[PDB]
């Protein structure tokens, strides 16, 4: 039918993407071996004796995570060529992953992409999972985004980037890699969804009451989001919205495509079953800042566009009712120039669960992808981190030593200044 | 994939190196004979980083033993886990460098590098993709400080891409061995700054101090000190050998802890560290690890850390554990101890989860910190250097062997700049 | 006559089948001696195989399997290296499925019972005890020898210990897995194990 | 292999009892501090959730790692749910297949799907004790 290719770059991209492929394999009823005991065609191919192989490529320079998948439970589920490994880590150096060691692996990467896209025409687009703060995540992520933009120029490229958090870093050179990648995904990607690590730590703490989480709890929640974005492609629904019409309803200006995410409900096993997941309150449990998945308060922002994807026992009457009460509720502000700022998508298939995982079954759910001007704070805070670094050239010698010219820091800085000014202007 | 080449030079380097291969073989479950026991995939899936197959099933270390007296090489061979090293990897000195950095580097060691650089060339070139080297040596002694630094100089200009990290012990603060410490330590330091990527500093008096109030051992031999230091050594390179939630190799750490190139001296620590008596009375959790790991009384290098500021630091956690409280504790220790840290660099700390714990425990952390507080040790060694040099004392040994008068003034001028560089960032 | 001719298995198989052919011809223009196609043997009788918990397992549950003989020794460092990879391979093959796919029957090169039991305590797949002559006859049939100590009839020693040989219904080697072989592709030649084609009929 | 403890003797349980509910295997010792900690809290939870209403809703098969007949019987006689037979080879089979090391790995609750495999994993060696209420059976019951 019409398919989508998922691309995983970097450590976070591999780990997040593997939870995605655990969920996709589970909901379509295909085993870890890869054979079931045409709705699944958007994520799995056919292969000979009734066995299905995903449309994903695994890319990392260090082998220590991609080799572990090859020896894991899903050893026959992926194509051996689809999991590509190097020998040495990029090591938090955007310069290293983009210039020196990036060129020898990008070729092998886009060979498989070429083969997998030429299977059928009329495919939707690309989903890319990468770490901004990482080396290979930012380095190799730009190289594929650059070279795919020149070849498959027309088509949609969606990005789900693990943006570095305000207080939490677990790194130090990460302000450098953030502003360097931002210059490279302003003019090469179509829609970018910003993810925060410690925001989801907040989600797991108050909504789900997991006082003591881990990365396995992170990637499950991301997998539910990604499934909700691509639910309309797979299953029949009342009113579908595809990945082509995402950028139509959410990107008003070509520069401005940095947009937050939210999911509701994030509810426990025991917590959920004793309370109405009403369609009215399932959205009221989405517009509050604390439910938002970026740690970026939109109260001092203005909503430019909004796209809601419902899943399950959802009727069109309650969707229109839920939108109307939100617009008349005062605490959020819409921009003057965008009256029809809502786009509703309804899918019949209920959310699937990973059993004995973290969440539960609920009869309905909503996933939010909203574009706002709240993004102005997260780039300004990243700029404040970067000016201290660049004030006296700290950790520059690693970057310039490999072959990256000094001064690319200067021009990427002013681009983020140019991006910062545009957001402030459009919010009048 | 990746292999790390081990080089063991000197008296101190052999003993801390013999005990280092004891715990790595323990970790990978290697029989002293050379076979394997321990029926797990994790241990053997990444073993070529430190070992090599021999067509008999036995794994040999990628380690090169190096000394100018055959005595300490004999002792290492003659112990258990002595059979493990290759006989060809031993290189022998027929003369012996008596504490003199001149003969370790200029005269006597110069003709024996030719022998040993061949060994390191044969082993490094044979691998698929070299990552780098680790060298354990002393700086007080002659052979450790002299020839160990020469070999550092030679393979840097030969393999200029690959990383290098040194487990070097310094002259101790209070009492001393090798009376010419400043004539050996200072003469190594100005060369170590030029051709080494990471330097991890160990002090004797720190290890005595650790073993006193924490472990309550009455009689610490070199058996337990080398066992303790080796526990910090395995913690650094665990992520290379085992899978984890957040991976960290040597190159990971080098870009992470080094703001500016010439400042690359560290401060090593390990946790947890409890007595045998009070072994089973503790709550081994991520609050308790971080309290113990940030302490002046836990560092392996007895420079006082709260007399300076932490420029950058890294905490490489180990074990089945969990990624938010380790994450929040890094934020918590940085927020409370604001005066202890540097201002212009935000978010100084690093987190690296290494999913396989050290053997027989459940949860640990190693701490590698680039601190400006280690400028007290460079002054105090230089304070000792000035007193001997102004009086031209013990110099006739060095200048008798073929070393210049102006070389000593250049060395003192080099480290005085190294002090001033660190002093500026307080 | 497959994969070898001068083996105890093939000698006893030829004896039985040709005896049976003669008797049938006497009772009833058949071709003597009988064809390799018309030859038949029972390989593992009822009391041969036994599981982890030392409960007897019949011939009949080897049907629809990819079945392989694991010739292994206690003391060999190469065997000790090979064993955890094959453990992981067995577990990840048999677990990601409703029914099980591959099955491994263990043949020992240990010197004694004590070593046999000590090494066998680890293994969860099927094993044949040391004292059974089946081990020796299978060993000569599949040409496994630790060293050339026994007279072999102009053969070359096909394998060194350890080695996994995928077997067929009639004693024919289904495929060869090159651990220490012509390919020397050690410790990950277990990946080459296909299970479309190698089915225990 | 599986034994239902009742008043007067021990009866084999029908495999129709396990149908329509969630079955958890409980890996435990006897006389261990955490074992003796977790027996009665689980007993209270089991009693309240099964007696609250009409229908039985969960079922826990207890599996031991004990070294004595007497110890096994002693730890088994004070529990309201069924157990696994000490002499059955299924017990050691379960140990080797689920990889409890035989410590911080005790006690353990692994809730099981219809195919006899890991439907969900839960460890008690931690400060929290709301994990009993956290294990929910409305999401993984057998047909």
């Amino acid at each position: 039918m019409r398919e989508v290719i998922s691309i995983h770059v970097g450590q976070a991209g591999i780990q997040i993407g593997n939870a995605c492929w655990e969920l996709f394999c589970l909901e379509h009823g295909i085993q870890p071996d890869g054979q079931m005991p045409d709705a699944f065609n958007t994520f799995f191919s056919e292969t000979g004796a009734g066995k299905h192989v995903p449309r994903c490529v695994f890319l990392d320079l260090e082998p220590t995570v991609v080799d572990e998948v090859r020896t894991g439970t899903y050893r026959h589920l992926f194509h051996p060529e689809q999991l590509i490994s190097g020998k040495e880590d990029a090591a938090n150096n955007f310069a290293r992953g983009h210039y020196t060691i990036g060129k020898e692996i990008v070729d092998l990467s886009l060979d498989r992409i070429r083969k997998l896209a030429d299977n059928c025409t009329g495919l939707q687009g690309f989903l890319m999972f990468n770490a901004v703060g990482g080396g290979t995540g930012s380095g190799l992520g730009c190289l594929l985004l650059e070279r795919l933009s020149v070849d498959y120029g027309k088509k949609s490229k969606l990005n789900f980037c693990s943006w570095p958090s305000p207080q939490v870093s677990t790194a130090v050179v990460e302000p450098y890699n953030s502003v360097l990648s931002t210059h490279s995904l302003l003019e090469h990607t179509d829609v970018a969804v910003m993810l925060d690590n410690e925001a989801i730590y907040d989600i797991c703490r108050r909504n789900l009451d997991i006082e003591r989480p881990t990365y396995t709890n992170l990637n499950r929640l991301i997998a539910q989001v990604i499934s909700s974005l691509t639910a309309s492609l797979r299953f029949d629904g009342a009113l579908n919205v595809d990945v082509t019409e995402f950028q139509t309803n959410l990107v008003p200006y070509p520069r401005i495509h940095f947009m937050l995410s939210s999911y509701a409900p994030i509810i426990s096993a025991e917590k959920a079953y004793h309370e109405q997941l009403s369609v009215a309150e399932i959205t009221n449990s989405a517009f509050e800042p604390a439910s938002m998945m970026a740690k970026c308060d939109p109260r001092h922002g203005k909503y430019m566009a909004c796209c809601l994807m419902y899943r399950g026992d959802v009727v069109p009457k309650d969707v229109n009712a839920a939108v109307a009460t939100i617009k008349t509720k005062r605490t959020i502000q819409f921009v003057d120039w965008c009256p029809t700022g809502f786009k509703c998508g309804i899918n019949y298939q209920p959310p699937t669960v990973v059993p004995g995982g973290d969440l539960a079954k609920v009869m309905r759910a909503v996933c939010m992808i909203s574009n706002s001007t709240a993004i102005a704070e997260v780039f300004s805070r990243m700029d404040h981190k970067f000016d201290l670094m660049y004030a006296k050239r700290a950790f520059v010698h690693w970057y310039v030593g490999e072959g990256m010219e000094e001064g690319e820091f200067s021009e990427a800085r002013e681009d983020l200044a140019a991006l910062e000014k545009d957001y402030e202007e459009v919010g009048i | 994939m990746r292999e790390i080449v081990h080089v063991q030079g000197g008296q101190c380097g052999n003993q801390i190196g013999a005990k280092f291969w004891e715990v790595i073989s323990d970790e990978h479950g290697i029989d002293p004979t050379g076979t394997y026991c321990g029926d797990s995939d994790l241990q053997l899936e990444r073993i070529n980083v430190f070992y090599n197959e021999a067509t008999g099933g036995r794994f040999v270390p990628r380690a090169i033993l190096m000394d100018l007296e055959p005595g300490t090489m004999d002792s290492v061979r003659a112990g258990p886990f002595g059979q493990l090293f290759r006989p060809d990897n031993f290189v022998f000195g027929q003369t012996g460098a008596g504490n003199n950095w001149a003969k370790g580097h200029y005269t006597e060691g110069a003709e024996l590098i030719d022998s040993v650089l061949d060994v390191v060339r044969k082993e490094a070139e044979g691998c698929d993709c070299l990552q780098g080297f680790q060298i354990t040596h002393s700086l007080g002694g002659g052979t450790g400080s002299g020839m160990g630094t020469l070999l550092i100089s030679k393979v840097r200009e030969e393999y200029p891409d690959r990383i290098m990290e040194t487990f070097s012990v310094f002259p101790s603060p209070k009492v001393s061995d090798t009376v010419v410490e400043p004539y050996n330590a200072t003469l190594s330091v100005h060369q170590l700054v030029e051709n080494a990527d990471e330097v991890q500093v160990i002090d004797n008096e720190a290890l005595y101090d650790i073993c006193f109030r924490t472990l309550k051992l009455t009689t610490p031999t070199y058996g337990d000190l080398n066992h303790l230091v080796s526990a910090a050594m395995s913690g650094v390179t665990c992520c290379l050998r085992f899978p984890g939630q957040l991976n960290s190799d040597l190159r990971k750490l080098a870009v992470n802890l080094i703001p500016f190139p010439r400042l690359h001296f560290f401060l090593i620590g390990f946790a947890p560290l409890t007595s045998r008596g009070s072994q089973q009375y503790r709550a081994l959790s991520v609050p308790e690890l971080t309290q113990q790991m940030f302490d002046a009384k836990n560092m392996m290098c007895a420079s006082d850390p709260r007399h300076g500021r932490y420029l950058t630091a890294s905490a490489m956690f180990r074990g089945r554990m969990s990624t938010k409280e380790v994450d929040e504790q890094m934020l918590n220790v940085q927020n409370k101890n604001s005066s202890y840290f540097v201002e212009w660099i935000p978010n100084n700390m690093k987190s690296s989860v290494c999913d396989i714990p050290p053997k027989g425990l459940k949860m640990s952390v190693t701490f590698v910190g680039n601190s400006t507080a280690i400028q007290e040790m460079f002054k105090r060694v230089s304070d000792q250097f000035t007193a001997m040099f102004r009086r031209k004392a013990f110099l006739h040994w060095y200048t008798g062997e073929g070393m210049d008068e102006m070389e000593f003034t250049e060395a003192e001028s080099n480290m005085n700049d190294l002090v001033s560089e660190y002093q500026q960032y307080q | 006559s497959q994969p070898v001719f001068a083996s105890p298995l093939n000698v006893e198989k030829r004896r039985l089948n040709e005896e049976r052919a003669l008797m049938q011809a006497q009772k009833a223009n058949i071709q003597l001696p009988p064809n390799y196609g018309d030859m038949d043997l029972i390989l593992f009788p009822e009391g041969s195989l036994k599981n982890s918990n030392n409960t007897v397992i019949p011939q009949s549950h080897l049907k629809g399997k990819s079945v392989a003989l694991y010739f292994a020794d206690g003391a060999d460092p190469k065997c000790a290296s090979l064993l955890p990879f094959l453990l992981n391979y067995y577990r990840t093959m048999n677990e990601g499925g409703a029914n099980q796919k591959i099955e491994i029957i263990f043949v020992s090169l240990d010197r004694d019972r004590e070593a046999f039991e000590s090494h066998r305590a680890h293994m969860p797949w099927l094993s044949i005890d040391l004292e059974n002559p089946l081990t020796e006859i299978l060993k000569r049939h599949f040409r496994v020898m630790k060293e050339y100590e026994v007279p072999t009839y102009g053969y070359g020693s096909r394998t060194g210990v350890p080695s996994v040989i995928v077997i067929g219904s009639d004693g024919r080697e289904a495929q060869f897995l090159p651990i220490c072989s012509g390919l020397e592709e050690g410790d990950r030649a277990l990946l080459r194990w296909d299970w479309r084609n190698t089915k225990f009929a | 292999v599986v034994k239902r403890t009742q008043q007067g003797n021990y009866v084999p349980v029908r495999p129709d009892h396990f149908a329509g509910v969630s079955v958890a295997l409980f890996f435990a010792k006897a006389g261990h501090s955490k074992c003796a900690q977790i027996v009665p809290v689980v007993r209270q939870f089991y009693k309240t959730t099964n007696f609250s209403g009409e229908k039985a809703v969960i079922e826990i098969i207890y599996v031991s790692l004990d070294k004595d007949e007497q110890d096994f019987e002693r730890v088994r006689a004070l529990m309201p749910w069924c157990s696994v037979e000490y002499k059955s080879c299924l017990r050691k089979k379960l140990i080797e297949r689920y990889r409890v090391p035989n410590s911080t790995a005790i006690p353990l609750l692994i809730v099981i799907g219809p195919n006899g495999e890991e439907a969900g994993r839960m460890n008690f060696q931690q400060s929290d004790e709301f994990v009993l209420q956290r294990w929910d059976y409305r999401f993984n019951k057998w047909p």
Partner: peptide, 22 residues
């Protein structure tokens, strides 16, 4: 006289076979 190795990877302990929806 050593002991078995008693770290289990985070990956292997929870990415195992998973129960199919009915």
């Amino acid at each position: 006289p050593t002991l078995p190795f008693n770290a289990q990877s985070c990956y292997r302990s929870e990415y195992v076979a998973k129960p199919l929806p009915p």
